[PDB]
Design a protein around this ligand. Structure first.
Ligand code: KPO
Lengths: 40, 150
């Protein structure tokens, strides 16, 4: 399997972007395999 | 290894994204599982990684050390499969864990967007997108995953 990288852009903050998405406050656990879960 | 954001492809399908900074390529472990990466005519080998953090670096140690300030809006520089890079500004939420709080962005993109960088207002990479949770309505929230610069 040929895994390869290709440039996609410059890393630059964009001025005058409008905020989207909410800001959830979540109780979370992280296991030793790197998986996050929600604490119920 | 010029600085910038890159797609991670398999031959093609886009399986992720990563950041080249200071000669080191940074992505999420689940994107490559440490496999070698072709870059033009060269090969990049894994140097450091951690399954629990879900991070891997190539060519040298992890270089990204900017931290979310816990207060300010951030930008996901999303590089979705088949689409141009785009900046999405958001106020992070919080993953509250037994080991501390981690900023988290409520932005939902295809699996192959994994590794896209999240930026502060100075353009520094405060972490990578794509290890997260699915909430009750089916939408996604990603940790702002940052490594340690030793
Ligand atoms: N709305 C959804 N599901 N959006 C996701 C957005 C993916 C962004 C990039 N990240 C990933 O691919 C990682 C890989 C794995 C890294 C693991 N350490 N992924 C994830 O973190 C999650 C992990 C996960 C999974 C289930 C959880 C349930 C409860 C609580 C927490 C949970 C966490 N994995 C997924 O979300 C997998 C998934 C679950 C349900 C449905 C889909 C995909 C179909 N969606 C897509 O086919 C594209 N979108 C999507 O796949």
């Amino acid at each position: 399997v040929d895994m390869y990288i290709e440039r996609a852009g410059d890393i630059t903050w964009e001025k005058d972007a409008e905020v989207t998405g909410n800001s959830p406050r979540l109780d979370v656990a992280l296991d030793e395999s790197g998986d996050f879960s929600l604490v119920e | 290894t010029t600085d910038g954001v890159y797609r991670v492809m398999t031959r093609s399908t886009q399986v992720g994204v990563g950041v080249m900074q200071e000669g080191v390529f940074h992505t999420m472990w689940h994107v490559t599982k440490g496999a070698a990466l072709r870059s033009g005519e060269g090969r990049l080998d894994p140097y450091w990684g951690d399954v629990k953090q879900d991070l891997v670096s190539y060519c040298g140690p992890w270089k990204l050390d900017a931290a979310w300030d816990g207060l300010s809006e951030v930008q996901l520089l999303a590089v979705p499969p088949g689409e141009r890079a785009k900046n999405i500004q958001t106020l992070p939420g919080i993953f509250k864990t037994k080991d501390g709080d981690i900023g988290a962005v409520a932005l939902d993109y295809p699996a192959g967007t994994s590794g896209s960088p999240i930026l502060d207002k100075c353009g520094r990479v405060i972490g990578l997108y794509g290890n997260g949770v699915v909430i009750k309505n089916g939408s996604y929230v990603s940790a702002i995953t940052q490594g340690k610069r030793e």
